[model samples]
Target: KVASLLSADLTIEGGVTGEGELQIDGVVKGDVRVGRLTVGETGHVEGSVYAEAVEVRGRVVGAITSKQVRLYGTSYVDGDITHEQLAMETGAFFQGRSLKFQR
Candidate 1:
């Protein structure tokens, strides 16, 4: 499947919705819905995210809901998470509740 790329030099202030994968290396200030979502080290999101799988390596200040969620070492998240599975690295910063649900 093809993946959508949001480069680090850009900024989006509205909703992002797609069926395939999405990688954000920029900034997004609205909600996101995708099959797979990846927030790169330079990315920053200020709204909710919904996906099948989510990987965060940057900053997020909103909620996240996914079947699988991963917070990498460089991640900084300040929102709640609802997932069926989760992985968080040692150096990741998180300030929220995590709720697990049936898959």
Candidate 2:
């Protein structure tokens, strides 16, 4: 698991990809492609994300491409996401990212 401690905002362009499990607690722009993505309670993504698995606890504004994606109670996505498995808790704010597929 790759964890990043962030307390500010970040911006990324399109076609940004990553590997392995990544945990974010900040803000991102553009698209993120990785293995496993975890959005913390204060994390936010403004573009797109592509990974194997995802767990959002904050906010996402673009599309998501993954195999397995999860949303926590405090998670929110405004775009679309693609995943094979999805789990959402109560009070979770989900907007988009719903493809539903396996890795």
Candidate 3:
């Protein structure tokens, strides 16, 4: 459900926002606000992230706030996750809270 994709060899130094879905296969150095976000296996983020849904397959160095989150095998996160739904695969790595929410 990706509306846009960032290539594996690319690097972004500014904020990213979108209404649909976004897939990142490279690196991000600023905040990302989107409807849905996916960090591909080679992706890396160096700033805060916010989205309706987020799937991490690579690395994140900042906090993530989302309605749902999935950390697949090989994923890595160095910050907290504030989410309503969270799942992590066998090889996923995390260093902070899986903050749950209630209605």
Candidate 4:
């Protein structure tokens, strides 16, 4: 899909809210709402994330609430996760709670 993209050279100080797919390689300091979210290795998000699916390859400093969540090996997360399904690769660092939901 042709998802919305936030490049690594940019930084967002406000919230991001939208539908469909979103790819982030920058930095966000507020909440994010999307259908699907992919955070690249250069990205960092400092607020809550709400989405249908989320894949993280960088760092997250807030809560993540989604139907599916995946963390790459290089990911570093410092907040809680609420998801229906979750997958975390080896070497990923997580420093918060993980809450799972039923289908």
Which pairs clash inside model 4?
Answer: none
Give per-residue lDDT, candidate 2, residue 7.
Answer: 53
Model 1 — which ten-residue stretch has the worst lDDT? 94-103
Give Cα distance to truth, residue 68, candidate 3, Å. 0.4
Which segments of candidate 3 are over 4 A away from where they belong? none
Q: What are the runs in model 4 whose C-alpha is more than 4 Å off? A: none
lDDT tens string, model 3, 7-99? Answer: 888887678567787888888888778888888878588888888888777888778888788887688888777888888887788887666
The parts of candidate 2 lying over 4 Å away from their true place are 7-9, 97-103
Clashing residue pairs in candidate 1 (N, C-alpha, C atoms within 3 angstroms)? none
Clashes of each: 0, 10, 0, 0
TM-score of each: 0.84, 0.75, 0.84, 0.85
Q: Which residue ranges in model 1 land beyond 4 Å of their true spot? A: none
- Top lDDT hit: 4
Query: Where does the lowest 10-residue lDDT sum fall in candidate 4?
Result: 94-103
Q: Cα RMSDs of all predictions?
A: 2.1, 3.0, 2.0, 2.0
lDDT of 2 by residue, 45-96 (tens): 7776677777777777777777677777566777766666777887577755
lDDT string, candidate 4, 1-103, tens digits: 5588778888876676788888888888877778888887785888777889987888888888887888875888887888887888875788888676765
The candidate with the higher TM-score, 1 or 2, is: 1
